[PDB]
Amino acid sequence: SKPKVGINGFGRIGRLVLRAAVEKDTVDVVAVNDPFINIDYMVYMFKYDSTHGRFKGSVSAEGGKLIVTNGKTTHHISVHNSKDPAEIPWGVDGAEYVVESTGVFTTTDKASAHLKGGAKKVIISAPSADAPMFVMGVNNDTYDKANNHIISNASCTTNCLAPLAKVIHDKFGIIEGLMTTVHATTATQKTVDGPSGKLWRDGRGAGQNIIPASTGAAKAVGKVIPDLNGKLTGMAFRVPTPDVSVVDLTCRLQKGATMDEIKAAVKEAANGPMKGILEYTEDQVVSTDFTGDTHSSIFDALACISLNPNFVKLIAWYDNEYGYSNRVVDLISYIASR
Amino acid sequence: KPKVGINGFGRIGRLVLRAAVEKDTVDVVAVNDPFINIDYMVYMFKYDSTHGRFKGSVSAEGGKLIVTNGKTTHHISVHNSKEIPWGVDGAEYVVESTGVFTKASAHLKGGAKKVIISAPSADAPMFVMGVNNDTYDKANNHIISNASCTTNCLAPLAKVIHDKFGIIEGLMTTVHATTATQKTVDGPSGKLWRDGRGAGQNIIPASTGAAKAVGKVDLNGKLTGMAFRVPTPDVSVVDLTCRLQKGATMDEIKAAVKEAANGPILEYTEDQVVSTDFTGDTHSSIFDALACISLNPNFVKLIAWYDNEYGYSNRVVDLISYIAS
Amino acid sequence: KPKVGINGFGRIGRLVLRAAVEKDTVDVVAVNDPFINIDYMVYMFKYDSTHGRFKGSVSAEGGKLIVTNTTHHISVHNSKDPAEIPWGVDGAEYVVESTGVFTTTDKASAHLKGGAKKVIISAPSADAPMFVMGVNNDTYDKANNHIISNASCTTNCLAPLAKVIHDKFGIIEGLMTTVHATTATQKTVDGPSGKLWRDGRGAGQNIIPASTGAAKAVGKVIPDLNGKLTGMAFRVPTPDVSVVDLTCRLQKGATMDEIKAAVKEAANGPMKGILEYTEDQVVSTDFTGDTHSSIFDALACISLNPNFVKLIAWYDNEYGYSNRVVDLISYIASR
Amino acid sequence: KPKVGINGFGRIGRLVLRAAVEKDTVDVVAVNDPFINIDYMVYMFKYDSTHGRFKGSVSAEGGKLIVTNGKTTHHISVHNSKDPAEIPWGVDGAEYVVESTGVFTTTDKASAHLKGGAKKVIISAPSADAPMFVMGVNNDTYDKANNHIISNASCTTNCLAPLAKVIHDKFGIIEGLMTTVHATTATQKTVDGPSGKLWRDGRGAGQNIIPASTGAAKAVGKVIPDLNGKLTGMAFRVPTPDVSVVDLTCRLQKGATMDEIKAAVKEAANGPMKGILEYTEDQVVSTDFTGDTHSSIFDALACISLNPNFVKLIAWYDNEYGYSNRVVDLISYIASR
Ligand SMILES: NC(=O)c1ccc[n+]([C@@H]2O[C@H](COP(=O)([O-])OP(=O)(O)OC[C@H]3O[C@@H](n4cnc5c(N)ncnc54)[C@H](O)[C@@H]3O)[C@@H](O)[C@H]2O)c1
Numbered sequence A: 001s002k003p004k005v006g007i008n009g010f011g012r013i014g015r016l017v018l019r020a021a022v023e024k025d026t027v028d029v030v031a032v033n034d035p036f037i038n039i040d041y042m043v044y045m046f047k048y049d050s051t052h053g054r055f056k057g058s059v060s061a062e063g064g065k066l067i068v069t070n071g072k073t074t075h076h077i078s079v080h081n082s083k084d085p086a087e088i089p090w091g092v093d094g095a096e097y098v099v100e101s102t103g104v105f106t107t108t109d110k111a112s113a114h115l116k117g118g119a120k121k122v123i124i125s126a127p128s129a130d131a132p133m134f135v136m137g138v139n140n141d142t143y144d145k146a147n148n149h150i151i152s153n154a155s156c157t158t159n160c161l162a163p164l165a166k167v168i169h170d171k172f173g174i175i176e177g178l179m180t181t182v183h184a185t186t187a188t189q190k191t192v193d194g195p196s197g198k199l200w201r202d203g204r205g206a207g208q209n210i211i212p213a214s215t216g217a218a219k220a221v222g223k224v225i226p227d228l229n230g231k232l233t234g235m236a237f238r239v240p241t242p243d244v245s246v247v248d249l250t251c252r253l254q255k256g257a258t259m260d261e262i263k264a265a266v267k268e269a270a271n272g273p274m275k276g277i278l279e280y281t282e283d284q285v286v287s288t289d290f291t292g293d294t295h296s297s298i299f300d301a302l303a304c305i306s307l308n309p310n311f312v313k314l315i316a317w318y319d320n321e322y323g324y325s326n327r328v329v330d331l332i333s334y335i336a337s338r
Numbered sequence B: 001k002p003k004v005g006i007n008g009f010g011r012i013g014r015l016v017l018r019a020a021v022e023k024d025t026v027d028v029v030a031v032n033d034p035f036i037n038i039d040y041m042v043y044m045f046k047y048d049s050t051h052g053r054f055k056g057s058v059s060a061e062g063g064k065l066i067v068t069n070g071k072t073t074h075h076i077s078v079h080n081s082k083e084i085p086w087g088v089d090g091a092e093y094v095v096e097s098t099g100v101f102t103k104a105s106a107h108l109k110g111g112a113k114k115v116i117i118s119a120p121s122a123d124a125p126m127f128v129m130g131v132n133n134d135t136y137d138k139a140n141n142h143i144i145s146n147a148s149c150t151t152n153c154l155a156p157l158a159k160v161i162h163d164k165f166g167i168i169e170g171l172m173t174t175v176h177a178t179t180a181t182q183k184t185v186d187g188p189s190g191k192l193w194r195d196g197r198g199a200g201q202n203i204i205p206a207s208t209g210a211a212k213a214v215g216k217v218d219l220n221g222k223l224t225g226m227a228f229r230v231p232t233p234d235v236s237v238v239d240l241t242c243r244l245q246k247g248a249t250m251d252e253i254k255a256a257v258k259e260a261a262n263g264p265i266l267e268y269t270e271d272q273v274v275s276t277d278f279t280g281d282t283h284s285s286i287f288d289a290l291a292c293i294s295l296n297p298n299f300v301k302l303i304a305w306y307d308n309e310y311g312y313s314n315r316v317v318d319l320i321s322y323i324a325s
Numbered sequence C: 001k002p003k004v005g006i007n008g009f010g011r012i013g014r015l016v017l018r019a020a021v022e023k024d025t026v027d028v029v030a031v032n033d034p035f036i037n038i039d040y041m042v043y044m045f046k047y048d049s050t051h052g053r054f055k056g057s058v059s060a061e062g063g064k065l066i067v068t069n070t071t072h073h074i075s076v077h078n079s080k081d082p083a084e085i086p087w088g089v090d091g092a093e094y095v096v097e098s099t100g101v102f103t104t105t106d107k108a109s110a111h112l113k114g115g116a117k118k119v120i121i122s123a124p125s126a127d128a129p130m131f132v133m134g135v136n137n138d139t140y141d142k143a144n145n146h147i148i149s150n151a152s153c154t155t156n157c158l159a160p161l162a163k164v165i166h167d168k169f170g171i172i173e174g175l176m177t178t179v180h181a182t183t184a185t186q187k188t189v190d191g192p193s194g195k196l197w198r199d200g201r202g203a204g205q206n207i208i209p210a211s212t213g214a215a216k217a218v219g220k221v222i223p224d225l226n227g228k229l230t231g232m233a234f235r236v237p238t239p240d241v242s243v244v245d246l247t248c249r250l251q252k253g254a255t256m257d258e259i260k261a262a263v264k265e266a267a268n269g270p271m272k273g274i275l276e277y278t279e280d281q282v283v284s285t286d287f288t289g290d291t292h293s294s295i296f297d298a299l300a301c302i303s304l305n306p307n308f309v310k311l312i313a314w315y316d317n318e319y320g321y322s323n324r325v326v327d328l329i330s331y332i333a334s335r
Numbered sequence D: 001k002p003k004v005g006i007n008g009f010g011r012i013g014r015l016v017l018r019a020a021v022e023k024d025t026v027d028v029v030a031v032n033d034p035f036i037n038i039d040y041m042v043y044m045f046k047y048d049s050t051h052g053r054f055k056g057s058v059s060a061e062g063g064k065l066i067v068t069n070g071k072t073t074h075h076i077s078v079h080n081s082k083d084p085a086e087i088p089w090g091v092d093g094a095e096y097v098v099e100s101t102g103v104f105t106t107t108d109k110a111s112a113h114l115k116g117g118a119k120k121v122i123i124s125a126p127s128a129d130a131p132m133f134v135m136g137v138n139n140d141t142y143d144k145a146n147n148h149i150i151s152n153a154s155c156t157t158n159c160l161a162p163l164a165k166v167i168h169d170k171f172g173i174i175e176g177l178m179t180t181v182h183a184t185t186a187t188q189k190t191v192d193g194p195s196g197k198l199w200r201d202g203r204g205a206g207q208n209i210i211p212a213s214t215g216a217a218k219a220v221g222k223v224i225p226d227l228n229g230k231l232t233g234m235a236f237r238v239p240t241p242d243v244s245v246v247d248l249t250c251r252l253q254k255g256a257t258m259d260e261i262k263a264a265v266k267e268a269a270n271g272p273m274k275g276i277l278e279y280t281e282d283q284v285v286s287t288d289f290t291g292d293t294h295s296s297i298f299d300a301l302a303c304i305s306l307n308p309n310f311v312k313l314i315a316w317y318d319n320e321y322g323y324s325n326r327v328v329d330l331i332s333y334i335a336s337r
């Protein structure tokens, strides 16, 4: 009936992918693996969520399986605690599609370990150095079932930028653009100044600081939108909020446009071919207004500004946790239909 | 030393007094704030959540505010008018830092000679040190404005890059700390609906005229911008996206700023800095070399830090100091 | 259903409306706030940083707020002076006084001049009588009590717990601390709060000691505990949800299991919906939007000995209280 | 001057070095941390989000850490061993080692430092079996001949015990219950994440008030034996980066007004407990004690009394910097014995 899914890494993305799966009812999660969270702890972490509130439904442990229900449907989920993804028995569980959301198996070689356990497809919940990247509504139809078995759903930021960039580029042509994302705190950061050896700024106390950071998210848009390769790059500022982020894209347009024309192009995409991916708003919103929003990108029409018809700053919101999680589920549904 | 009066003993008012004491280039002789009594004034100056305890002694004696750091001692007269007798106090320069007299000439009737508005003014002339302060003309400028914190950050950076490479056009974002105009939880801000939303919970899009204001200090009409208010108590950052006339390497950009930083407001760093590293920094603008990014030699994104409290408050003192000369 | 008016469309005012719409046990027909026009009211009611988007539709039509989940049609006014609000004309029988600035009986009595009959002040009052649902609400007297108080969020949390513990074991004496979320009276950065200096210091940076009469007030709503309770507060940087920390001496010694049972029995019985019991490993955000007055945190409690214990109780200081305001109106309307 | 080595260059490790440089009563000669190489150590010491830029100069030269305040210079050998048994404290000359990793708190684990040539080890935390000391309270019970592995207890215990001593000596504490409202630390998480033994501690720190267990009040009974079994308590972790506060609710033997209690604390603060216990009557908040070197600052006005025999006493502490100064003081003390 529905594609059967395994989740490796029951973290912010892993747990919220499960939440999104239950609400959307387009896939069936049959297994979860996390060596740092036993079944009773899984129940607790799924039940209570500081950002997204109490799970709207019931969750419990029965027979060494996670039982998750929202009244309508019930998911019986096998639970494993293996550190080596090769040891996860996905095949026995019937997990055809595996969400690789631990944050430490992001290459094709490491992610392929899931195939040894009997999985057919793996979706890395992060950018990959070598696995092909996909963004729903932008290049997912370029997916090639016979040759793409290990794929990436890119990053939260790329999923915000790419649908907007695609709309603007299609309509006006982006010669070049520069992106800033003001990004909420994530699990890789620290509560007080601590060790972050590869990235020193990322170790500084998240709650105290505005933190400059490099991201390949804008550059990666050139990978899901080939015509913009080399035409986009960017960076981030990490700020002390628990969730929801915003993209700030400064771009030069080939064909001149008024803000009214820009709004119209976005609304058309939002109301049509990009429904559920790209949304449009004219309200006086702030970040918390998008906690739990399922879209990849919410264009903030009122926050946008133009210097002249060929030079503009475009603003788009995203729930980096829940928006992205909804796209992982959607990406699985798409490739399973292939 | 020029004698200064302060109206509104808030974040800028109090920190202006602090910078004044450290720099010892002015003599504060009076303060007015009708919502703050002299005993309350002692406390607010003494303890500061952001900048720590005042380094020195402060107390009330003889109905006057007594402020000392060992080196100097300032005796400050206190008033509570919402009518301020500035002339009697000898207060030649009045900083209008209530934020609500952006109206300002009322201070001259009390005996003031020059007035510094601690904010942009709709009708008063604007000046920022290091950019247009030498354009001041003593005979005609008696009611003036020292612009905003953000403007003092962008323009010095803008000047160096433009002088060296030429900026055709640019768009600015400032990631900005929480201020007193904001709310602790969702509350009324009738003119600016987003600014009423809980500051500690939110990233808040906000408008700023700072880039436009740079057009007053050849770049008029070539820059505009906006802001995001974020949940930090102080220190903000400028994110300047620009098109260059003459192509440049990042090494070339870093070199122009470093050379300027070591010479003629703006500093250069190549360290792995974050916002708290600039709490108490007195510069108007601090260029973040490693955080800058270029797409190509003619399209770059430039990052500059500023303590929006302490930089500007220091400038309030300096604009006073320059004009007295 | 009782017809209700709301004065002051702030955190409590707006959430009393949310609680009213969800409960459908009262009908809100009018609102007054001179700093928030009808269009702004829609925005403030629609979007909420703490409690999320309104679950329903809200709009302005004909100078009226249209709020539906059932449909409530609400007349809107904008007077600073409560004497000018036509509660009688709009048909507002009970007025929620949630402005924070008319906490005296004389000041609050202005709503009676506009044609309202019964008034519930959303705060402690210096001279108006205070009530806490599940504790002393039956002492309400329709003939003589027309201007009343629903006490404080903190009092609504402590008093029900205090009642259970005192009834069951006897409280000789107790001292309360509430670790309290930031509220609208505080400041984003160090600013003027002339009457209360610590409250002026930047909320996001600080733990702020503050006085509260909430604990003493339990002695007004439970007379036998008068002079036996007091306390204080620490304001901390969270946007909502607070916790009570009650250290008390018991007359009759008790184990914690026995203490737990006394609370659970009450929670499963006469105090259902008022006092709740939990044994989970909860933290503050887990009570965001919780409608209870008090949630006893069984696992966070500690005892030194059977007669000296520390009891922990959570409360959504915004939404728990807002629901009690509604329940109280429904209650006195049942009178 | 006593020569000191530091294991674990974390919040305590680093601020102990800062406090050492400022007090200049010890000489730091070695540091070990396998997750922080020498160049990174420079950065982490130089810049501090909480306590500001290091007041002095810091650099890397010759695989050694060079730390100076103009007057004095500390030349620090740098190591990166995971096993503390492999650290050459003797070769570097580290007689006293601050054990500030958080993962070697038992005596057996702490004893690993002895094999490297260290003589004394100070565990920067409570210990299950190593003896605990609080400066100004029970450090004179230290026994040089037999105590080689010791504990400086916890930050919270260093706040409570000096106040507990003063109130108890003067009025007699029959029994007491403590709450500490505590700043966030490094064991917590930025967003909801795994904390398998302590589920509440895994919940996002910036969003939550978090109940937590602490043995700090009970531990006062070990450094003040007469209060054994007479104190216990718990904690709430709140979203601030530093500075915490003790909330002590106690029953008194001899009835007292708050003014008498204040007077008793004032006397101790200006006399035998100077530099350890401080008294203030100001309208303070937590940030006013950022960087404060005292173990405990009594907040006289925040105190409240129910009756002459039942009171609630409020005391502040910089859990990072107060405790760090005491570590140095304890080294300075035992070295003088
Ligand atoms: N959080 C976001 O906003 C966000 C958005 C989009 C993408 N992502 C990406 O998704 C991935 C997950 O990020 P997150 O925020 O959910 O992180 P997280 O730290 O919340 O989740 C990581 C989880 O993986 C588990 N894990 C660790 N090692 C494991 C192993 N060997 N086997 C199985 N499980 C293991 C951990 O116990 C933890 O529960 C990251 O790569 C991140 O870059 C994150």
Ligand SMILES: NC(=O)c1ccc[n+]([C@@H]2O[C@H](COP(=O)([O-])OP(=O)(O)OC[C@H]3O[C@@H](n4cnc5c(N)ncnc54)[C@H](O)[C@@H]3O)[C@@H](O)[C@H]2O)c1
Binding pocket: B007, B008, B009, B010, B011, B012, B013, B032, B033, B034, B035, B036, B081, B082, B097, B098, B099, B100, B118, B119, B147, B148, B149, B179, B180, B181, B308, B309, B312, C190, C191, C192
């Ligand atoms: N905070 C910053 O980063 C910053 C930087 C540059 C400029 N500014 C501007 O400077 C101005 C001051 O801002 P602030 O941060 O000190 O705000 P603030 O709230 O800290 O200061 C306001 C003070 O003015 C006093 N006041 C109120 N009404 C008054 C009256 N009728 N007469 C005299 N005094 C009165 C208040 O008692 C209060 O102490 C604002 O216009 C602000 O936009 C702020």
Ligand SMILES: NC(=O)c1ccc[n+]([C@@H]2O[C@H](COP(=O)([O-])OP(=O)(O)OC[C@H]3O[C@@H](n4cnc5c(N)ncnc54)[C@H](O)[C@@H]3O)[C@@H](O)[C@H]2O)c1
Binding pocket: B186, B187, B188, C007, C008, C009, C010, C011, C012, C013, C032, C033, C034, C035, C036, C079, C080, C081, C082, C098, C099, C100, C101, C122, C123, C152, C153, C154, C183, C184, C185, C317, C318, C321
């Ligand atoms: N927020 C809480 O957690 C909480 C809990 C329990 C009780 N209370 C009490 O309830 C009251 C409401 O607090 P709040 O947090 O909603 O404050 P708030 O700032 O959210 O609400 C204030 C509102 O009252 C309005 N107002 C101001 N003057 C007015 C006038 N003259 N007439 C009508 N309306 C006016 C303002 O426009 C504002 O919208 C407070 O007194 C508070 O002490 C608050």
Ligand SMILES: NC(=O)c1ccc[n+]([C@@H]2O[C@H](COP(=O)([O-])OP(=O)(O)OC[C@H]3O[C@@H](n4cnc5c(N)ncnc54)[C@H](O)[C@@H]3O)[C@@H](O)[C@H]2O)c1
Binding pocket: A193, A194, A195, D007, D008, D009, D010, D011, D012, D013, D032, D033, D034, D035, D036, D081, D082, D083, D084, D100, D101, D102, D103, D124, D125, D154, D155, D185, D186, D187, D319, D320, D323
């Ligand atoms: N932070 C406070 O407020 C505070 C106060 C008093 C005591 N303490 C105690 O101090 C100790 C350290 O706490 P912290 O807050 O500095 O934590 P932290 O995480 O800031 O410091 C721990 C440091 O130890 C290092 N480390 C980890 N494993 C190691 C190993 N095998 N060998 C050597 N070094 C290793 C880490 O790289 C890290 O830098 C803990 O026991 C804590 O209980 C903390």
